[PDB]
Symmetry: C4
Subunit: 390 residues, 4 copies
């Protein structure tokens, strides 16, 4: 039978190139004969033999007449769905896993674990599904919107670690960590370090002994609190990334926050998810970041890198690596994923491109994928090609 | 090759939580591009590697123009269909098994058996299908609408037991039992005890030596006749559940039926299916019941429990365990199902939520699933989110 | 790997009952969101692990605007398609095998062979497909519409035998036989006996040493020429069935054709396909026939039997066994099929029910299946439930 | 596990016959309920157990409202999609592999490699995908629309060879060759001989030691430069086919280009893809060509042959072998493919039939397949049966 997954050295490449685009709404005209689901919070988790495209649907499709409610984040209709990667998320292609308005996913070499969050805002709840079975739950500790990553969780030899959090968006949201094995929580990690507001952690293996996530602070700063989880002692420590190249949105001009690394500067009320992906080489490591082109809005998407060094102390700017999405195209949530080759892991960064015709219409995104391919420079950007009028 | 199924100890949990929702009609607008089938009598039967969502379709989809006939129970168009669980029951996703207007299903570790009932009301007939093969039938003994469970049948080491019945709804409907092995009836069980009217038996393993069903009495009482089948001697004995917490609908105020356990009280003409599921623990057992919130109507759904004791004699009230469906939401048929983990069985209760715009329109339901997850208390209810006007 | 198929003793039963109904057009309203293909000439061929529903589509779906041409039998658009049995023949569910306006199919325990016929009426051609590969062809010998069975072909230990024919409908159509192994014709059988007009042979194993087909004579008689192929010497002999119960349509009153068995009587210009299926028992054999209720038209369907005896000499009437389709319902082509159980073969008879709103509309059928189940008598008929106006 | 593919001797046959037709737009009426994708550049690549129908979709379906842009060759929406052969290329049936506006595909007995080209016209890029993984890229050497075959690539014992090119359509487009193993380029072949303009190479194994492609010269000639790649030394040599029967389009009367084989004659600005397929016999070889009936336009399709001899020197005319598509039907790109039997390879030629209602509408093709079957002569042509008004 199957064996447990561990990260290996990433495949060989020097830059990312444009891989794939799933734009369901290109097939959502009232004059079309198709039915793409209203979803957001998309992500890809790649198991051994396959990758899955997950998302939270509003239990609604376009065209239709259940548009009002779609721009809202949490309700009793949302669900975690998936289609194997490369398939359009239509009503029939999609498998509905469980009810949730927050979520994550990961395949341990042997099976899929699905994490989903639902219930009351004051008493929400985390739910685990191992394959087809409901196996566990984790309660709301801070009684203030229990949430999870919204990206892939990370398994190493049978144990998968998940980030959750709880608290006010404008205040203190302190995240814990969940160690799940066979769809059951075998440990509850309480991080150390700057813990004032950590949410929507994009986590990836920086080797076998450690996992690092670039995350989200909704209040206090435009910097990203950076996690490092030692899988061997089962301890967590978080501290803000020191790079003058700020990754959250909004943010001010770069290098504008004066003072030691550990200084938040101004609050810049809000945040956004950003893709973070390692390129574990033999003698060295590359970390890839992507951020919105706009500093106040969700317009555009550009990706950077900086090999080695320490996320925590390096004041320095990151090396820009090209533009995946132009300022005229949307650039919302971002996450990183990894494809399993025979003898190497391929790093990738997905970019949710939300179709936002505002308040009285439907609300869904597209998904542009970029993955490390060969050398030279990033060559093309992505456009959705969607007309919200059709 | 595959091995025979037996129940094991249920997985560890203390309460049920909201698992999943399949609302096909959320995708049935005339302005939509989808096609969910008009069905009712839904149920889930979980084999080793998978669960299936079954139902009797009126061989019709929404939107369409074959709505007139859908509110009726038996005709020559109805069929037993299935989709793996988590898939929406559309025209193309669904597999049609055989023609039937009554039915059941169960997977013996090796294959699916499908039971379906059709023919004339005066001479209906039970039909068995082992995998893809028609293998057997069982004739109408009381010539008065031969029917079956409408929920999952129960297999233990190669033998599956099914409940059937026959008779007037307003009168005497005495049920027999069918022992099927390899899609062929190897024994005909005639129960003992109070046998005046037993129908729509929700049956589940209360261990290896016994199966218990909470069922339906359409005439004589608002209590539920409770079955106990000893799989070892192949004998059946039925007696009304003594709980002051009445489970059928309609029913009067609880504890209102004065007298020994065995007393029907007033007729309360009618009944409904209710989900019943055991939580077999090592030193003890939990039985889970769900009933309509409304005592005269099919509005709402709440679930209870009471560990151990005897269904037959216990006059006592049951412990309420939360509300799965609110009084403003429908709560029709209910059934229990069990998911197969690696080393444990997960108990579940499905709730059919019928969309009933009455007499001159379409008639189909939704399916809300709740399964045992962790501890604390049931946290959320279900709503269909369907507008019968679209 | 897989082993070669041979017929075994049929499963145990005494009568046929109503098994399944595939009515695609129940989902073909202009107000529906579905797309069932315009097809006719449906048949089912059951391999080891599965049965397939085949048909010749006019490369068109309902609703649409390619209806004109559908009532015609041969054109350059027709194709042999299939869906596993129980699935509705829609545009996406269906697999297109090859181009043909005549056809057959059979699975040898190891793979599917697909036979299809196309080309000019004066120089048509038979084409073999083994799995996904084009392997062979067989030319038009009588240059007058080379055709094939329109039902399942029959394989025994690696060799499959197929009937073809060629000639005028109003005149002499002498059929040959094709022995195919691994998708290649290894022998060309020329039958013996009355060979004036044999077409659309419904063939089934009457044991290991022989295959018998009840067939079609378009000119000369309302009786059915009956084939017997000895698989051991590879010889064929045909002679008209002697039963006073005539099986072709049209036909006159039964027992009206005076004279020895071998007498055609009046021509009764025309014919139709009829399902023929054996029930090979240990000490005996049952042959099942179905014929139209109407003697001049294609209205209704009734099925008969007569165990043992000789198709060739028995003047006697057959035993009626019930009505599968009422005079108010259509009853066109019929064929027999067999389902593979673990230790027995289940006999079946399918009935094509053509939706014929005549000349200026669409033209497609439904498929009612009846299979041997238990004992007693056939209990129900089939209706399509289709309204050609929607 | 699986073993590496090598070509074997082709199956036995003498002529090609009409195999299959995939006309998605037959299901694209505004009154239909289907959704076929706007695609062109279709091709089939057959692995061991299966064949796939690939094409570059304009990320659009018919009916819809994204028609404007479809007649253009390169944009940021195009994608390489596939459906197993015999399935209609609809939105849900189709798998999207990667973004590309040029492409190829091939299965090495063990896995699928997908090649796709995208990026800026001045700096386009070749991209390799082994199974689900992005593994490599190859940059634009002549900075003038890096393109690839548009047909199947060819693998022999683990190594697959691909043709690419780069340059002006009106000028010098010199092609290189790519040797890919496990989805990574292990060698870059630079051909020898007449190398002025070689593009869209249709390549097939002429044995184990060699691969030959009949290709496209957009400027200089109406003859086809003919490649021969020695898989053993990894060298390439190209020279124009000498046949008086010219294969490119446009072309003048045949035998009109006076002079030695190596003479281009007049430019005949333009070209088209043509199917080329070998029939490797034991003592001899057959090469099959197909060309447009029209000499100036893309109307019709006829196929020829000539066994043995040398593509390079033979001035002679080819033997016509029938007409697959009539002058009243379109005949655009053509390619050759091979189906894997148990002990032999079946040669095939696909013909893209473009639906070209010009400038302000949708733009997609159909696919007619012809494969070697038995003997005698090609018997039928193909028509799409599409009405661009519906
Ligand atoms: C818990 C929750 O509602 N999830 C959530 C989203 O679904 C979306 C966004 C967002 O910033 O667009 C934000 C948040 N968020 O609150 O983090
Ligand atoms: C035999 C039959 O018609 N089945 C049936 C149903 O399908 C539904 C109901 C019902 O109470 O809604 C009731 C019954 N019932 O009669 O039990
Ligand atoms: C060869 C051919 O055209 N096949 C055919 C059909 O498809 C249908 C019928 C028929 O009697 O309805 C008849 C015939 N037939 O001619 O046998
Ligand atoms: C590179 C590119 O644009 N590919 C391409 C096509 O997609 C189509 C045609 C063509 O001749 O129709 C031609 C060409 N071509 O330029 O070869
Ligand atoms: C982690 O462990 C596995 C073996 O247990 C090894 O193959 C893998 O490469 C390790 N990770 C890295 C980056 O080396
Ligand atoms: C019933 O039998 C099987 C072994 O035959 C055992 O594993 C199972 O646990 C038993 N049921 C229970 C509740 O113990
Ligand atoms: C025909 O042959 C196989 C063994 O080769 C046997 O099992 C089968 O039963 C035979 N057919 C019948 C009716 O006995
Ligand atoms: C090429 O090699 C394989 C064995 O490696 C052989 O079977 C195949 O036939 C060869 N090709 C031809 C045409 O012989
Ligand atoms: Ca569909
Ligand atoms: Ca912030
Ligand atoms: Ca009652
Ligand atoms: Ca006749
Ligand atoms: Ca040219």
């Amino acid at each position: 039978e199957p064996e447990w997954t561990y990260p290996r050295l990433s495949c060989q490449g020097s830059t990312f190139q444009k891989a794939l685009l799933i734009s369901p709404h290109r097939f959502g005209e009232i004059k079309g004969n198709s039915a793409p689901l209203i979803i957001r919070e998309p992500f890809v988790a790649c198991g051994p033999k396959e990758c899955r495209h997950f998302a939270l649907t509003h239990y609604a499709a376009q065209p239709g007449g259940y548009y009002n409610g779609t721009r809202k984040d949490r309700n009793k209709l949302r669900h975690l769905v998936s289609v194997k990667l490369g398939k359009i998320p239509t009503v029939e292609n999609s498998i509905f896993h469980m009810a949730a308005w927050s979520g994550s996913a990961c395949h341990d070499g042997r099976e899929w674990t699905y994490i989903g969050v639902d219930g009351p805002d004051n008493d929400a709840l985390v739910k685990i599904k191992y394959g087809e079975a409901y196996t566990d739950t984790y309660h709301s500790y801070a009684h203030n919107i229990l949430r999870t990553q919204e990206s892939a969780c990370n398994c190493i030899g049978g144990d998968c670690y998940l980030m959750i959090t709880d608290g006010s968006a404008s205040g203190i949201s302190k995240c814990r960590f969940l160690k799940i094995r066979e769809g059951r929580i075998i440990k509850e990690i309480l991080p150390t370090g700057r813990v004032e507001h950590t949410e929507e952690c994009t986590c990836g293996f920086a080797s076998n002994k450690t996992i690092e996530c670039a995350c989200r602070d909704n209040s206090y700063t435009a910097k990203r609190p950076f996690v490092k989880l030692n899988v061997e002692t089962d301890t967590a420590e978080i501290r803000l990334m020191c790079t003058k190249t700020y990754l959250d949105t909004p943010r001010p001009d770069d290098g504008s926050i004066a003072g030691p690394c550990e200084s938040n500067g101004d609050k810049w009320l809000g945040g956004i998810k950003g893709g973070f992906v390692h390129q574990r080489m033999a003698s060295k490591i590359g970390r890839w970041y992507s951020r919105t082109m706009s500093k106040t809005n969700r317009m555009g998407m550009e990706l950077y890198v900086r090999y080695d060094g320490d996320p925590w102390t390096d004041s320095d700017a990151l090396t820009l690596s090209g533009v995946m999405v132009s300022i005229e195209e949307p650039g919302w949530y971002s996450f990183g994923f990894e494809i399993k080759d025979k003898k190497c892991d391929v790093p990738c960064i997905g970019i949710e491109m939300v179709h936002d015709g505002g308040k009285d219409t439907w609300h869904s995104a597209a998904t542009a994928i970029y993955c490390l391919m060969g050398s030279g420079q990033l060559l093309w950007d992505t456009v959705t090609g969607v007309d919200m009028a059709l």
